Design an enzyme around this catalytic site. Structure first.
Site, short mmCIF file in Angstrom:
data_model
loop_
_atom_site.label_atom_id
_atom_site.label_comp_id
_atom_site.label_asym_id
_atom_site.label_seq_id
_atom_site.Cartn_x
_atom_site.Cartn_y
_atom_site.Cartn_z
N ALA A 75 5.57 44.55 -10.60
CA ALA A 75 5.19 45.12 -11.89
C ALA A 75 5.09 43.93 -12.91
CB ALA A 75 6.16 46.15 -12.33
N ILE A 76 3.93 43.34 -12.92
CA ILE A 76 3.66 42.10 -13.62
C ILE A 76 2.71 42.39 -14.74
CG2 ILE A 76 2.35 39.90 -13.21
CD1 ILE A 76 4.40 39.72 -10.81
N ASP A 82 2.17 49.27 -3.88
CA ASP A 82 1.70 49.02 -5.29
C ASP A 82 2.42 49.93 -6.22
OD1 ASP A 82 -0.10 47.30 -4.23
OD2 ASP A 82 -1.87 48.49 -4.71
N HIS A 95 -6.66 52.95 5.09
CA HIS A 95 -7.30 52.94 3.80
C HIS A 95 -8.09 54.25 3.61
CE1 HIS A 95 -9.85 51.70 0.51
NE2 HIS A 95 -9.43 50.44 0.55
N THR A 115 -14.73 46.36 5.33
CA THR A 115 -14.90 45.21 4.51
C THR A 115 -13.91 44.13 4.90
OG1 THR A 115 -13.44 46.07 2.81
CG2 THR A 115 -15.77 46.70 2.74
N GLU A 126 -5.16 41.68 1.48
CA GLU A 126 -5.58 42.79 2.31
C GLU A 126 -6.43 42.35 3.47
OE1 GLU A 126 -6.47 46.84 0.97
OE2 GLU A 126 -8.61 46.27 1.20
N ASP A 177 -6.45 58.64 -3.27
CA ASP A 177 -6.87 58.68 -4.66
C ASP A 177 -7.63 59.99 -4.87
OD1 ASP A 177 -8.24 58.45 -7.08
OD2 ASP A 177 -8.50 56.31 -6.77
#
Ligand SMILES: CCCCCCO[C@@H]1O[C@H](CO)[C@H](O)[C@H](O)[C@H]1O[C@@H]1O[C@@H](C)[C@@H](O)[C@@H](O)[C@@H]1O
Ligand SMILES: CCCCCCO[C@@H]1O[C@H](CO)[C@H](O)[C@H](O)[C@H]1O[C@@H]1O[C@@H](C)[C@@H](O)[C@@H](O)[C@@H]1O
Ligand SMILES: O=c1ccn([C@@H]2O[C@H](COP(=O)(O)OP(=O)(O)O)[C@@H](O)[C@H]2O)c(=O)[nH]1
Ligand SMILES: O=c1ccn([C@@H]2O[C@H](COP(=O)(O)OP(=O)(O)O)[C@@H](O)[C@H]2O)c(=O)[nH]1
EC number: 2.4.1.40
Lengths: 267, 267
Positions: free
Chosen positions: A52-53, A132, A154, A166, A224, A247
């Site tokens: 957490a930057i 994350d 993913h 990808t 990744e 998501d």
């Protein structure tokens, strides 16, 4: 204690096991009561690392409050928050057997998990999970995920053919995966395993990233891309389905998802 | 290197994973090329124990000749033949990297694997597999079965409800399993695992059998009854399907069996 039924697939819509016989974790494949007992018998401690930057400190409160409701409830948990702002870490109340340590701090997640997994983590924790911070838990994420090494499908690519993955495609990169190769596209936002396998992975991906840097090259999707190359060569012993990384705003709630467990909130 | 397909079950007719996320091994679930490479990278040695006592020595020649064609081909194999007649062991020619030792000798399989697994086996072998000698291999039996601990679905019972399982039902017996309990009915003719897990199992089942004997009781299906009780409490990390233990004369070749790998020939 329903009797497992030999002649009835646990799922008829999705693959629940990889060709190297690693379970693919979906709702319907597991009995949590059996698993909870197996891991409690070993007094399992789970480490969870999150970065957490800068502005990302704003994500911690919902992240921590929802992990308290959904993550490894009943088991020992140690949160490790890597931040550039110690005082901006919110004081979330934790359930019994759960603790949080603040560790003050592209290449950077891998190197830092690798350094701390070799110090503190060994030592403190049996399994390490790395996610994350801009995420919230919405449903159960428990000991069903735990195994020597795992990655997560993913959410954008689980229906894709490998050529559309990808992956890093330039052979000059340590993360290079050729066009005719690849099992799955794993997301960098959710991986873990025993401390030892996590130390090995993050050490490999960090060493590979330096090699790429010394050669003036950056993998297309950064750590990744390296994660995918590592899990191609060192196959995970479980794969999480995209229930574990979703998501909903982007992708909805398709029929193959019976639960959305850990989701994006609207490196 | 076909790409695993996330949206297509590897099988639509059978359960390929247990509720504690152990793979159930069937044709269609595994890519042998991937698995062979994983185990070769560790230079895996497989021990196979078989008892050939009295008249059963007559089974050894076909057992050994067919194991040479089908069992763990390409990997290191050590056969351990326990017999009361050393000179009646036939001289079967072995492939490279494969050896046979003769060990001269109801309770008796468990105790003897337990004694020898603590001496020789440790030590000589990474995995130990234990089968009956009145059997022949007809198809591939390879490193797909290998795991810390496995049992095999009994060919007569895989379609059965648990109440119809011939578990030991008398609570006076160490092998007692109550009527509302039980995942699977495992056959005593095919089990194995790492040497350590095999030492633990055979030690447990041997200690439980002595306790039962001191109490004037014999489990209904002998060491098989104890095997089932042990695997109820210590859940196998893979289950073999009945491809791995079949009787074609008795049971035919049903549609869910795409291969008959290891079969009865017409404790
Ligand atoms: C609205 C933008 C859509 C991007 C979807 C593809 O996700 C990205 O995929 C690359 C690899 O091809 C990376 O994995 C990247 O981090 C992914 O984006 C993140 O994940 C998606 C699901 C969504 O939450 C994005 O907003 C994230 O940035
Ligand atoms: C023709 C006799 C049919 C017996 C079938 C049930 O098999 C037996 O089951 C008990 C437990 O209920 C034991 O597991 C026993 O060893 C089994 O018999 C053996 O396995 C079957 C499949 C068949 O090959 C028999 O001839 C064996 O004696
Ligand atoms: O300035 C930053 C950039 C990244 N991150 C961390 O690294 C993760 C990955 O990036 P984002 O989440 O930035 O990427 P996608 O996951 O690619 O949107 C973030 O969740 C944070 O945990 C951070 O803490 N501060
Ligand atoms: O007199 C005997 C009885 C049993 N066995 C061994 O123990 C196994 C189990 O019994 P059978 O095979 O006698 O039982 P089912 O498997 O119950 O027919 C045999 O395969 C042999 O390996 C043996 O060697 N000699």
């Amino acid at each position: 204690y329903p009797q497992p039924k030999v002649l009835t697939p646990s799922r008829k819509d999705v693959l629940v096991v990889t060709p190297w016989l690693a379970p693919i974790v979906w709702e319907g494949t597991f009995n949590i009561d059996i698993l909870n007992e197996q891991f409690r018998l070993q007094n399992t401690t789970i480490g969870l690392t999150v970065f957490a930057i800068k502005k990302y400190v704003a994500f911690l409160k919902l992240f921590l409050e929802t992990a308290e409701k959904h993550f490894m409830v009943g088991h020992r948990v140690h949160y490790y928050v890597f931040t550039d702002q110690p005082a901006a870490v919110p004081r979330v109340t934790l359930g019994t057997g759960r603790q949080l340590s603040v560790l003050e701090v592209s290449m950077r997640r891998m190197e830092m998990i690798s350094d701390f997994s070799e110090r503190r983590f060994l030592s403190e924790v049996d399994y390490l999970v790395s996610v994350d911070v801009d995420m919230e838990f919405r449903d159960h994420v428990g000991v069903e995920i735990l195994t020597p090494l795992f990655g997560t499908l993913h959410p954008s690519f689980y229906g894709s053919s490998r050529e559309a993955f990808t992956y890093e495609r330039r052979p000059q990169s340590q993360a290079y995966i050729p066009k005719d190769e690849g099992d799955f596209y794993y997301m960098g936002a959710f991986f873990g395993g025993s401390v030892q396998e996590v130390q090995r992975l993050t050490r490999a991906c960090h060493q590979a990233m330096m090699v790429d840097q010394a050669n003036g090259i950056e993998a297309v999707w950064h750590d990744e891309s390296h994660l995918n190359k590592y899990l191609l060569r060192h196959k995970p012993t479980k794969v999480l389905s995209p229930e574990y990384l979703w998501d909903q705003q982007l992708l909805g709630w398709p029929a193959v998802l019976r639960k959305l467990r850990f989701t994006a909130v609207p490196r």
